[PDB]
């Protein structure tokens, strides 16, 4: 490109004067960007190149690592505090683990906007926002779980019936009650990404954990370690 919207996932010192950015861009997908000069007292880059700051970006180069040409912000935003800060950090960690470089995910970018607009305009609780983004993300990664029909038998899910999740398998009606067990009502909540009560929220969390695991593959989440130690 081309001017395009973006958010910074991470920012680190790359040299005496420069930063290395890991950026989520709307049209190019995830890219790594060097910001020359952005460490220097006398650059405006510095204040702008933070997570959760909406950006418009131009950058160039052929390699995996591109070079930032210019960046524009409006809100030098930090919309995000305490539980909601650690939530945003969480979402950026997810994307870091999960997003392949330089694949356009433009719908996902919209989902990330909405999730950010949510985390900004809430006090208690971030969870519906979070669960909704996880599911959009799983969608966009292509996990293809059917929430609304029993796997194999093809039978419609009933609110009050119980079901077991099989990774890679779908949901099947079951009276085995354990940590893979969901309620037809909970499956409907998941399919709608609406969670009107604590019971569906709870079960949403339990599910998205499981479904995300095969994508995080192996290492635990730092941002969880962060919440633990602060709360």
Listed by start position, the domains of the chain span 1-77, 78-231
Alpha-carbon span 101 to 93, nearest angstrom: 14
Alpha-carbon span 204 to 26, nearest angstrom: 27
Name 153's Cβ contacts closer than 8 Å, sequence gap at least 6: 172, 173
Residue 169: Cβ-neighbour burial (10 angstroms; 0-12, 13-18, 19+): exposed
CA 187 from centre of chain: 21
Nearest CA to 139 out of 212, 223, 219 is that of 212
- Structural tokens at position 123: 């006090």
Residue positions counted in the chain: 231
Q: For the structural domain made of 78-231, what CATH number should be given?
A: 1.20.1440.120
Spell out where the chain is interrupted, by the residue before each break (C to N > 2.5 A). none
Q: Which helix (H) or strand (E) holds 120?
A: helix 106-120
Residue 68 C-beta-side C-alpha neighbours within 13 Å: 26
Per DSSP, the three-state class of 40 is coil
Write down the experimental method used for this entry.
X-ray
* Residue for token pair 């398998």: 169
Alpha-carbon span 102 to 80, nearest angstrom: 28
- Structural tokens at position 34: 């060097």
Strands (E), the chain: 4-13, 19-25, 29-35, 55-60, 65-73, 162-166, 170-173, 181-183
Alpha-carbon span 12 to 21, nearest angstrom: 7
C-beta atoms surrounding 88 within 10 Å: 24
CATH class name, domain 1-77: mainly beta
Strands (E), 36-80: 55-60, 65-73
């Amino acid at each position: 490109e081309g001017w395009q919207r973006a958010f910074v996932l991470h920012s680190r010192p790359w040299s005496e004067t420069s930063l290395m950015l890991d950026v989520f861009t709307e049209e190019s997908g995830r890219v790594r960007l060097v910001a020359k000069g952005a460490r220097s007292k006398r650059s405006t880059l510095k204040g702008a190149l933070q997570p959760f700051t909406p950006l418009l970006l131009r950058f160039g180069g052929r390699g995996e690592v591109k070079t930032l040409r210019s960046a524009e912000a409006v809100s030098l935003a930090l919309p995000l505090s305490g539980i909601t800060l650690y939530s945003g950090l969480y979402i950026n960690e997810l994307l870091s683990r999960v997003l392949e470089y330089e694949t356009r995910f433009s719908e996902l970018f919209f989902d990330y906007l909405h999730c950010i607009q949510s985390l900004a305009g809430v006090t208690g609780t971030p969870e519906p926002a979070l669960r909704r983004f996880e599911l959009a993300l799983l969608g966009h990664l292509g996990y293809g779980v059917n929430f609304t029909h029993c796997a194999g038998s093809g039978e419609p899910v009933d609110d009050t019936m119980t079901y077991r999740y099989r990774e890679e398998k779908g949901f099947i009606a079951s009276v085995v009650i354990d940590n893979k067990t969901f309620t037809g009502r909970q499956l409907k909540a998941l399919n709608a990404r609406e969670f009107p009560d604590a019971d569906t929220l709870r079960a949403a969390k339990r599910f998205t954990r499981m479904a995300l695991k095969p994508y995080l593959g192996g290492k635990p989440l730092k941002s969880r370690e962060l919440f633990r130690q602060f709360m």
